[PDB]
Amino acid sequence: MTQAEIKLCSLLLQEHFGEIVEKIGVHLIRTGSQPLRVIAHDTGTSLDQVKKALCVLVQHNLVSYQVHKRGVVEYEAQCSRVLRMLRYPRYIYTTKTLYSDTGELIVEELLLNGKLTMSAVVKKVADRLTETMEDGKTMDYAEVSNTFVRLADTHFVQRCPSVDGIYWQANLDRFHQHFRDQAIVSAVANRMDQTSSEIVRTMLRMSEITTSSSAPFTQPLSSNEIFRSLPVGYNISKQVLDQYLTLLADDPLEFVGKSGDSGGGMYVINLHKALASLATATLESVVQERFGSRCARIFRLVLQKKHIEQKQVEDFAMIPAKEAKDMLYKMLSENFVNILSAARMLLHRCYKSIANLIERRQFETKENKRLLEKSQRVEAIIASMQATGAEEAQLQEIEEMITAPERQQLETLKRNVNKLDASEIQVDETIFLLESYIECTMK
């Protein structure tokens, strides 16, 4: 499935909605397609509790329902859809980035309330932005709506189909398109230079509609029209563009390759090749993570030919025999070369690490429950103090409640909450990559 995939799903639902949604969700994954009744029977849970759980499931766009064989309304969960709940913040913040905070909010609710019509969102946010606005001026519904439309135009927002409305949702596919796009652009930017990567961005910008998020290669595009779709910040010449192009295609890395020429040369982007190299580098950093620079350097030499045999291993190693033997074992030991294979393996290892993360976060607030509220009251004492009876001695009394270790633990826990939160994000990006390669290898 895998096991960690399931476990992860569970934790997800638990955090967002409750034990009800989790139990049933878990069951919908575990037993595939099932009517309301068989779910309420195998779970040992009533039908109203079942019905409540399904509400938060579908409304939020995750569970599917279809009328099977004997006209029975059967229900089903979709694993990938559950896991997308992870990228959710990054999806959000990138939106904040691109179409301001106005955008930030639009998306913010479209996931957390799931299915919502155009209007509902528009006003929801306008008021949710009038509360932030300096007392007055108000948020004109229009700007809100513009950004919304702009989202539906760039396909970052699309409609809820059919089996003052009606419903709209988040097109995390065009998000995958953009993350794919960015990961790529930046890879050029670090493996080549800024100008090159800007060309890429130009290519992807005209390959954001005519091509897919899982296509191995884009659509052919001539030097001339690319030179035409040039950004305004770049006043770069044709011949410049030409030496650049020839360089890009004929690059040992090869994330781009020529298709015709023709005039002024037909050119393609190698999505497959690009993804594989991305994953490869990730692997390099992992080898350097647990088996260090020593084994990472040797790993980098495994990129030319091999696994199997050692004749050329110890030779290209530049170290004694016994050493080359040991490290050769360690790399094939946890299956490190088989590209896709190690990729999928790694993927599971990700899911595992995540389980750990949530576990520790969950438990830290769990066992430190009797400290959470103690802090809350403390704050609710300066609520009616900074303004009414600004009493400094009262503030000291507040300080004497929270003895040294309790607050040092609040800091300890808070910092640990962070170590987790950060690691979490990191893994997310990593997962997007892996899965995107996995789907890319689906040609």
UniProtKB/Swiss-Prot annotation:
One of its GO terms (biological process) is positive regulation of interferon-beta production. GO terms for cellular component: cytosol; nucleoplasm; RNA polymerase III complex. It is found in: Nucleus. The keyword Transcription applies. Belongs to the eukaryotic RPC3/POLR3C RNA polymerase subunit family. Antibodies against POLR3C have been found in the sera of patients with systemic sclerosis (SSc). DNA-dependent RNA polymerase catalyzes the transcription of DNA into RNA using the four ribonucleoside triphosphates as substrates. Specific peripheric component of RNA polymerase III (Pol III) which synthesizes small non-coding RNAs including 5S rRNA, snRNAs, tRNAs and miRNAs from at least 500 distinct genomic loci. Part of POLR3C/RPC3-POLR3F/RPC6-POLR3G/RPC7 heterotrimer, coordinates the dynamics of Pol III stalk and clamp modules during the transition from apo to elongation state. Pol III plays a key role in sensing and limiting infection by intracellular bacteria and DNA viruses. This is DNA-directed RNA polymerase III subunit RPC3.
